[PDB]
Amino acid sequence: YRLKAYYREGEKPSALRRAGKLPGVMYNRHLNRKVYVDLVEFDKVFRQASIHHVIVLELPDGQSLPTLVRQVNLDKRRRRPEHVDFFVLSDEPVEMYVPLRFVGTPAGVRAGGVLQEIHRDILVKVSPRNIPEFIEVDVSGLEIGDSLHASDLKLPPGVELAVSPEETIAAVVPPEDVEKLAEEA
Amino acid sequence: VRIKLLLECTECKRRNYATEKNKRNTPNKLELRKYCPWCRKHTVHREVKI
Amino acid sequence: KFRVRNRIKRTGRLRLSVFRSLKHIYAQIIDDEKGVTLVSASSLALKLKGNKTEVARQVGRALAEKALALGIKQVAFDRGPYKYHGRVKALAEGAREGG
Amino acid sequence: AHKKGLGSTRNGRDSQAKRLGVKRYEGQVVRAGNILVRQRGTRFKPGKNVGMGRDFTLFALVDGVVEFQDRGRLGRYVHVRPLA
Amino acid sequence: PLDVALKRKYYEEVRPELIRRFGYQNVWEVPRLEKVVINQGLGEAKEDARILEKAAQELALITGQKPAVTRAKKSISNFKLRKGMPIGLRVTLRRDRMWIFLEKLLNVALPRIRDFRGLNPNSFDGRGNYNLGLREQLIFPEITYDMVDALRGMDIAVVTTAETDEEARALLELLGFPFRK
Amino acid sequence: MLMPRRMKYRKQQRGRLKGATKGGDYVAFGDYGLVALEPAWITAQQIEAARVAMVRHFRRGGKIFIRIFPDKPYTKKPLEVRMGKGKGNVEGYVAVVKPGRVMFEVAGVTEEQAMEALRIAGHKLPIKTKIVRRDAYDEAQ
Amino acid sequence: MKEGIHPKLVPARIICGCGNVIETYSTKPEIYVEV
RNA sequence: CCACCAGCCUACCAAACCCUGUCAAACUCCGAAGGGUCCCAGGUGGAGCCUGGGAGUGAGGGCGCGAGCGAUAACGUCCGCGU
RNA sequence: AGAGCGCAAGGGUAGAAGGGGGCCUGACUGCGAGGCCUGCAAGCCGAGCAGGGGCGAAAGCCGGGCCUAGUGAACCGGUGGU
RNA sequence: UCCCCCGUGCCCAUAGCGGCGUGGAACCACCCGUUCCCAUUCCGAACACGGAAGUGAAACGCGCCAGCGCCGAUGGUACUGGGCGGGCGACCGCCUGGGAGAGUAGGUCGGUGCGGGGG
């Protein structure tokens, strides 16, 4: 979806920030210059899409170049946004994370023990034509001390995988009742 | 060091010297091996004294 | 794997790289500096006799003369897996004082 | 004031530290006999017309110029160009 | 080129059966034989001297050749000799005399093992070889009651071109090996 | 309450503390997170007291993850014994905490629950804190 | 099998216990066994 | 719950490996701003160099960042560069 | 290269220092340029040259030891000797 | 002056690892023999030596692929020469010039120099 865009130059980093606009960068196989945009609207847009869905930045050069984000480098101290990277899209093989949707409340759950998941996004290679909005995956009946991983998840056809996939996707573990104070003994 | 002892080597046919060291525990008796004299050429040298 | 830089133990100054196959000797004189080689002879690659040993003798000997024929005194002796059996050229005739 | 116990020690010791390192860098002239590297290991293996001795030391063999060298799969080196 | 039973019958049974069954299209690729090695791990020579090595040569003197003893690595204070100089018997066998071993092996060594339902199959490397041994030592031909002291086992080996299991076992049907299967 | 298990040197030097935090500044784990603002130590005593404080507030809770680890000696000497002589004794095990550092995460609760949990627990911490959700940082191994 | 003190070879038999007339060749010259 | 030996099996704990974060003065794949130093050149200054006589010094203190000690206490202490 | 590398540690190490055997005794004498280090005095580096040797066909290295601890100015006197 | 193999040198892993295919008409390698030189702390495995009808299986030589392993921009933060602040303090900010680490895109199954034997 749409955000503005602004061609960056040889202007000092700090100032662009403490004026009104966060700075950025874009690169695709050969195309590399420097860019930047507003803060507040950018933050709004980001909070939705970010490295989940697709961005479309219409730039003061005449066009409407659509990218994805990629990497959110911050200041860490009083941590908060400060220069991101953008990825100029196409139709070529590309790995990226897909936010997953654990749907349905299992048996390990409701018995007490709660899901201690591993991921909320999986690395997967796809053609940029496939948009796997979010794999609204099962988690029908996970048990306490029970796990699930691998290719267990449904994958939207074409949208391949990119781990092992023995990467354990999630699992349910015990609570932490006041009987853990008896442990203090 | 002492008790493992140290010794000098002496030629034959009278005198010629150097300054070396020994060791007893290994079944060693007459320490005897080559060297060179001040006067003349290559000779044996026998273990001797302090 | 007789690498060991037997090279280095002879990399005093000025080599002479030789090696054998199943049937053919490859006697060559290599100078370093930049890497430039120099002088050749081969038991069964000079179109010569078909008896490894003696040919090699003569071949080295051939090369031997060749050495002095183009201004050679003493150099090294690049040989890997030798077991030192002379190869009674040993380039000992070999001008060089191979042996 | 109460001066009862007090846990002593057995630690404080060091070394009359000799000064070790690259004595002569590059671009430097030597009259042979001048040592260019006092090292403990072989951080600097011999170069051209440079020698080594019992204490791992790159010293001069001629009257020329120290030249530095690196060889990933062989180590680091220090040499002396001739200057004829 | 001294030929006998297992060698000649190596030629005859091996070539056709092997290739025609498994399809080898190369003269020097046929899953042939390689070395055959025998080994004795006695931790009894903690001292014992080479009075007990007389029993070590005894072993290889009935197999034909002059044995070579090796030693050991590091510290086994839990079970004495650590520094590593007691005894480690090894002998390597090439073609001809190796064929002697295999011969006397299949012909008389195996017989008077009373409880002999056949050899242990599963002991295949997978990467393509076989490793075992035995207990009753004097089962070998040129050694009657007199030689041995009490009991003494052994650890043989067989190195082969074999890269799979079945080809190795078939190789042992053409070279004929008494299995339990 | 955490520490190593006898390792290398016992006594080590406390040193001054800058503020790059080196790393550890997002959620990734739980869902709600307590992160700090004052460059100080976290005390094993406190550590336990806060972990409890959370657990305590929400009986039969979820899973409370502890990112930081208290693995530094308190070089403390006795009392009224005059100076010099020896270093001290390893005592009170703690850790370096430089602001903008995740220290504990609550997962699987009410909004209110993790709110007041992190609230009270961190309120018991040797300093003061900020409590954040889980979003703007996503993508970091 | 070179070296020197090598414990030898030579032909052996197997005068077994089934009328068997086996041709063998080993360190000892007169071998006879069972089957 | 069978042996010439097997087989299948847990919100117990756990070798290793893997994923998930991270810790370090005496850990280091990487490793700067600096710093030291060898040649080209500027540089005329109570600069620098060489022999030579007379010295006085060798309780120091403060201030800044840099590390130790201390309790990230002391007009505390003990070093580093700087004043 | 994470083992061994005599014994603490650190650097170093198989393109060997480690590990095997053969041979031997340079664990030489007379020196020693030019250096490291440096308040002095000490300590530490080494080609080279002569002798006369040990190893190797040689090329070659050998004036102990993988490297840094294993040490004691001078005065006193014993010692074999010119 | 060229296309191929071999004895061998240089950069330092964009050369290494691994699946695929491969070439011997010369080179090369296995391989033929263990009696003459030689030797296995035992085996002719290794080095050694006299030698064919085969082979190109391996060893090796060459091509494809990135899968491991290798290098890795750009930006911007870190940290900081040197210059000024602010807070009892733990510490923090402005100036200038320098300028990483981790990661992101991409890239990589070599580069080259010699001397002979072949067409």
mmCIF file with all atom_site columns, N, CA, C and O (backbone and C1' of nucleotides) in Angstrom, chain I residues 36-48:
data_model
loop_
_atom_site.group_PDB
_atom_site.id
_atom_site.type_symbol
_atom_site.label_atom_id
_atom_site.label_alt_id
_atom_site.label_comp_id
_atom_site.label_asym_id
_atom_site.label_entity_id
_atom_site.label_seq_id
_atom_site.pdbx_PDB_ins_code
_atom_site.Cartn_x
_atom_site.Cartn_y
_atom_site.Cartn_z
_atom_site.occupancy
_atom_site.B_iso_or_equiv
_atom_site.pdbx_formal_charge
_atom_site.auth_seq_id
_atom_site.auth_comp_id
_atom_site.auth_asym_id
_atom_site.auth_atom_id
_atom_site.pdbx_PDB_model_num
ATOM 1  P P     . C I 1 36 ? 69.428 -1.480  18.877 1.00 0.00 ? 36 C I P     1
ATOM 2  O "O5'" . C I 1 36 ? 68.655 -2.640  19.651 1.00 0.00 ? 36 C I "O5'" 1
ATOM 3  C "C5'" . C I 1 36 ? 67.592 -3.357  19.034 1.00 0.00 ? 36 C I "C5'" 1
ATOM 4  C "C4'" . C I 1 36 ? 67.038 -4.434  19.939 1.00 0.00 ? 36 C I "C4'" 1
ATOM 5  C "C3'" . C I 1 36 ? 66.673 -4.002  21.355 1.00 0.00 ? 36 C I "C3'" 1
ATOM 6  O "O3'" . C I 1 36 ? 65.400 -3.386  21.439 1.00 0.00 ? 36 C I "O3'" 1
ATOM 7  C "C1'" . C I 1 36 ? 67.939 -5.995  21.447 1.00 0.00 ? 36 C I "C1'" 1
ATOM 8  P P     . C I 1 37 ? 65.209 -2.014  22.256 1.00 0.00 ? 37 C I P     1
ATOM 9  O "O5'" . C I 1 37 ? 65.613 -2.383  23.753 1.00 0.00 ? 37 C I "O5'" 1
ATOM 10 C "C5'" . C I 1 37 ? 64.923 -3.383  24.494 1.00 0.00 ? 37 C I "C5'" 1
ATOM 11 C "C4'" . C I 1 37 ? 65.671 -3.735  25.760 1.00 0.00 ? 37 C I "C4'" 1
ATOM 12 C "C3'" . C I 1 37 ? 66.088 -2.549  26.619 1.00 0.00 ? 37 C I "C3'" 1
ATOM 13 O "O3'" . C I 1 37 ? 65.060 -2.060  27.461 1.00 0.00 ? 37 C I "O3'" 1
ATOM 14 C "C1'" . C I 1 37 ? 67.958 -3.949  26.282 1.00 0.00 ? 37 C I "C1'" 1
ATOM 15 P P     . U I 1 38 ? 64.803 -0.477  27.541 1.00 0.00 ? 38 U I P     1
ATOM 16 O "O5'" . U I 1 38 ? 65.978 0.046   28.482 1.00 0.00 ? 38 U I "O5'" 1
ATOM 17 C "C5'" . U I 1 38 ? 66.138 -0.468  29.798 1.00 0.00 ? 38 U I "C5'" 1
ATOM 18 C "C4'" . U I 1 38 ? 67.576 -0.406  30.245 1.00 0.00 ? 38 U I "C4'" 1
ATOM 19 C "C3'" . U I 1 38 ? 68.142 0.987   30.484 1.00 0.00 ? 38 U I "C3'" 1
ATOM 20 O "O3'" . U I 1 38 ? 67.811 1.514   31.755 1.00 0.00 ? 38 U I "O3'" 1
ATOM 21 C "C1'" . U I 1 38 ? 69.660 -0.278  29.178 1.00 0.00 ? 38 U I "C1'" 1
ATOM 22 P P     . G I 1 39 ? 67.684 3.103   31.948 1.00 0.00 ? 39 G I P     1
ATOM 23 O "O5'" . G I 1 39 ? 69.107 3.534   32.530 1.00 0.00 ? 39 G I "O5'" 1
ATOM 24 C "C5'" . G I 1 39 ? 69.555 4.878   32.431 1.00 0.00 ? 39 G I "C5'" 1
ATOM 25 C "C4'" . G I 1 39 ? 70.679 5.179   33.397 1.00 0.00 ? 39 G I "C4'" 1
ATOM 26 C "C3'" . G I 1 39 ? 71.789 4.147   33.520 1.00 0.00 ? 39 G I "C3'" 1
ATOM 27 O "O3'" . G I 1 39 ? 72.709 4.182   32.447 1.00 0.00 ? 39 G I "O3'" 1
ATOM 28 C "C1'" . G I 1 39 ? 71.194 4.933   35.667 1.00 0.00 ? 39 G I "C1'" 1
ATOM 29 P P     . C I 1 40 ? 73.293 2.819   31.825 1.00 0.00 ? 40 C I P     1
ATOM 30 O "O5'" . C I 1 40 ? 74.386 2.328   32.876 1.00 0.00 ? 40 C I "O5'" 1
ATOM 31 C "C5'" . C I 1 40 ? 75.554 3.094   33.139 1.00 0.00 ? 40 C I "C5'" 1
ATOM 32 C "C4'" . C I 1 40 ? 76.304 2.559   34.334 1.00 0.00 ? 40 C I "C4'" 1
ATOM 33 C "C3'" . C I 1 40 ? 76.827 1.136   34.203 1.00 0.00 ? 40 C I "C3'" 1
ATOM 34 O "O3'" . C I 1 40 ? 78.096 1.098   33.577 1.00 0.00 ? 40 C I "O3'" 1
ATOM 35 C "C1'" . C I 1 40 ? 75.706 1.398   36.284 1.00 0.00 ? 40 C I "C1'" 1
ATOM 36 P P     . A I 1 41 ? 78.502 -0.118  32.614 1.00 0.00 ? 41 A I P     1
ATOM 37 O "O5'" . A I 1 41 ? 78.419 -1.411  33.548 1.00 0.00 ? 41 A I "O5'" 1
ATOM 38 C "C5'" . A I 1 41 ? 79.434 -1.682  34.508 1.00 0.00 ? 41 A I "C5'" 1
ATOM 39 C "C4'" . A I 1 41 ? 79.007 -2.736  35.503 1.00 0.00 ? 41 A I "C4'" 1
ATOM 40 C "C3'" . A I 1 41 ? 78.569 -4.072  34.922 1.00 0.00 ? 41 A I "C3'" 1
ATOM 41 O "O3'" . A I 1 41 ? 79.651 -4.929  34.619 1.00 0.00 ? 41 A I "O3'" 1
ATOM 42 C "C1'" . A I 1 41 ? 76.953 -3.342  36.463 1.00 0.00 ? 41 A I "C1'" 1
ATOM 43 P P     . A I 1 42 ? 79.449 -6.112  33.553 1.00 0.00 ? 42 A I P     1
ATOM 44 O "O5'" . A I 1 42 ? 78.417 -7.102  34.255 1.00 0.00 ? 42 A I "O5'" 1
ATOM 45 C "C5'" . A I 1 42 ? 77.740 -8.099  33.503 1.00 0.00 ? 42 A I "C5'" 1
ATOM 46 C "C4'" . A I 1 42 ? 76.462 -8.551  34.169 1.00 0.00 ? 42 A I "C4'" 1
ATOM 47 C "C3'" . A I 1 42 ? 75.508 -9.319  33.267 1.00 0.00 ? 42 A I "C3'" 1
ATOM 48 O "O3'" . A I 1 42 ? 75.816 -10.698 33.182 1.00 0.00 ? 42 A I "O3'" 1
ATOM 49 C "C1'" . A I 1 42 ? 74.337 -7.569  34.297 1.00 0.00 ? 42 A I "C1'" 1
ATOM 50 P P     . G I 1 43 ? 76.143 -11.357 31.754 1.00 0.00 ? 43 G I P     1
ATOM 51 O "O5'" . G I 1 43 ? 74.783 -12.067 31.358 1.00 0.00 ? 43 G I "O5'" 1
ATOM 52 C "C5'" . G I 1 43 ? 73.864 -12.453 32.363 1.00 0.00 ? 43 G I "C5'" 1
ATOM 53 C "C4'" . G I 1 43 ? 72.465 -12.096 31.954 1.00 0.00 ? 43 G I "C4'" 1
ATOM 54 C "C3'" . G I 1 43 ? 72.102 -12.452 30.523 1.00 0.00 ? 43 G I "C3'" 1
ATOM 55 O "O3'" . G I 1 43 ? 71.750 -13.816 30.370 1.00 0.00 ? 43 G I "O3'" 1
ATOM 56 C "C1'" . G I 1 43 ? 71.427 -10.231 30.982 1.00 0.00 ? 43 G I "C1'" 1
ATOM 57 P P     . C I 1 44 ? 72.340 -14.665 29.141 1.00 0.00 ? 44 C I P     1
ATOM 58 O "O5'" . C I 1 44 ? 71.482 -14.160 27.896 1.00 0.00 ? 44 C I "O5'" 1
ATOM 59 C "C5'" . C I 1 44 ? 70.072 -14.325 27.871 1.00 0.00 ? 44 C I "C5'" 1
ATOM 60 C "C4'" . C I 1 44 ? 69.421 -13.528 26.764 1.00 0.00 ? 44 C I "C4'" 1
ATOM 61 C "C3'" . C I 1 44 ? 69.967 -13.720 25.358 1.00 0.00 ? 44 C I "C3'" 1
ATOM 62 O "O3'" . C I 1 44 ? 69.551 -14.926 24.739 1.00 0.00 ? 44 C I "O3'" 1
ATOM 63 C "C1'" . C I 1 44 ? 69.630 -11.422 25.760 1.00 0.00 ? 44 C I "C1'" 1
ATOM 64 P P     . C I 1 45 ? 70.443 -15.601 23.578 1.00 0.00 ? 45 C I P     1
ATOM 65 O "O5'" . C I 1 45 ? 70.362 -14.557 22.376 1.00 0.00 ? 45 C I "O5'" 1
ATOM 66 C "C5'" . C I 1 45 ? 69.111 -14.236 21.782 1.00 0.00 ? 45 C I "C5'" 1
ATOM 67 C "C4'" . C I 1 45 ? 69.278 -13.577 20.437 1.00 0.00 ? 45 C I "C4'" 1
ATOM 68 C "C3'" . C I 1 45 ? 70.307 -14.198 19.510 1.00 0.00 ? 45 C I "C3'" 1
ATOM 69 O "O3'" . C I 1 45 ? 69.842 -15.378 18.875 1.00 0.00 ? 45 C I "O3'" 1
ATOM 70 C "C1'" . C I 1 45 ? 70.476 -11.829 19.448 1.00 0.00 ? 45 C I "C1'" 1
ATOM 71 P P     . G I 1 46 ? 70.890 -16.431 18.266 1.00 0.00 ? 46 G I P     1
ATOM 72 O "O5'" . G I 1 46 ? 71.518 -15.645 17.048 1.00 0.00 ? 46 G I "O5'" 1
ATOM 73 C "C5'" . G I 1 46 ? 71.327 -16.063 15.714 1.00 0.00 ? 46 G I "C5'" 1
ATOM 74 C "C4'" . G I 1 46 ? 72.328 -15.355 14.860 1.00 0.00 ? 46 G I "C4'" 1
ATOM 75 C "C3'" . G I 1 46 ? 73.698 -16.012 14.790 1.00 0.00 ? 46 G I "C3'" 1
ATOM 76 O "O3'" . G I 1 46 ? 73.754 -17.043 13.811 1.00 0.00 ? 46 G I "O3'" 1
ATOM 77 C "C1'" . G I 1 46 ? 73.961 -13.758 15.415 1.00 0.00 ? 46 G I "C1'" 1
ATOM 78 P P     . A I 1 47 ? 75.082 -17.926 13.579 1.00 0.00 ? 47 A I P     1
ATOM 79 O "O5'" . A I 1 47 ? 75.509 -17.546 12.094 1.00 0.00 ? 47 A I "O5'" 1
ATOM 80 C "C5'" . A I 1 47 ? 74.528 -17.416 11.074 1.00 0.00 ? 47 A I "C5'" 1
ATOM 81 C "C4'" . A I 1 47 ? 74.782 -16.212 10.196 1.00 0.00 ? 47 A I "C4'" 1
ATOM 82 C "C3'" . A I 1 47 ? 76.053 -16.240 9.363  1.00 0.00 ? 47 A I "C3'" 1
ATOM 83 O "O3'" . A I 1 47 ? 75.951 -17.044 8.199  1.00 0.00 ? 47 A I "O3'" 1
ATOM 84 C "C1'" . A I 1 47 ? 75.836 -14.122 10.382 1.00 0.00 ? 47 A I "C1'" 1
ATOM 85 P P     . G I 1 48 ? 77.146 -18.050 7.814  1.00 0.00 ? 48 G I P     1
ATOM 86 O "O5'" . G I 1 48 ? 78.452 -17.124 7.819  1.00 0.00 ? 48 G I "O5'" 1
ATOM 87 C "C5'" . G I 1 48 ? 78.615 -16.058 6.886  1.00 0.00 ? 48 G I "C5'" 1
ATOM 88 C "C4'" . G I 1 48 ? 79.635 -15.033 7.342  1.00 0.00 ? 48 G I "C4'" 1
ATOM 89 C "C3'" . G I 1 48 ? 81.081 -15.499 7.391  1.00 0.00 ? 48 G I "C3'" 1
ATOM 90 O "O3'" . G I 1 48 ? 81.702 -15.473 6.120  1.00 0.00 ? 48 G I "O3'" 1
ATOM 91 C "C1'" . G I 1 48 ? 80.567 -14.310 9.371  1.00 0.00 ? 48 G I "C1'" 1
#
